[PDB]
Amino acid sequence: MLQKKIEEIAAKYKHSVVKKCCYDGASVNNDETCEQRAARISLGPRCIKAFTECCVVASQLRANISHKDMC
Amino acid sequence: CLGX
């Protein structure tokens, strides 16, 4: 309520790529990229794995952020 | 989730 939540959770996803990636996961529609990236993956580039646990988690909480939280 |  006084700051963000998964936002920085992504801010930490190695600024290299996993960062802007995980952001992608919980940034675009709940399935805008979470899918095209966590579904039709060819060789698991990077945002799909990072942002897959980061996008899925974002969902788990964002829906009813109250219990524990995954990535 | 993390990549490094």
From Swiss-Prot, chain A:
Disulfide bonds: 21-47, 22-54, 34-55
Region (Involved in C5AR1 binding): 15-44
Compartment(s) where it occurs, according to its Swiss-Prot or TrEMBL record: Secreted
Domain Anaphylatoxin-like: from-to ranges: 21-55
Positions annotated as glycosylated: 64
Role: Mediator of local inflammatory process released following cleavage by C5 convertase. Acts by binding to its receptor (C5AR1 or C5AR2), activating G protein-coupled receptor signaling and inducing a variety of responses including intracellular calcium release, contraction of smooth muscle, increased vascular permeability, and histamine release from mast cells and basophilic leukocytes. C5a is also a potent chemokine which stimulates the locomotion of polymorphonuclear leukocytes and directs their migration toward sites of inflammation.
Name of the protein: C5a anaphylatoxin
Organism per entry: Homo sapiens (Human)
Lineage: Eukaryota, Metazoa, Chordata, Craniata, Vertebrata
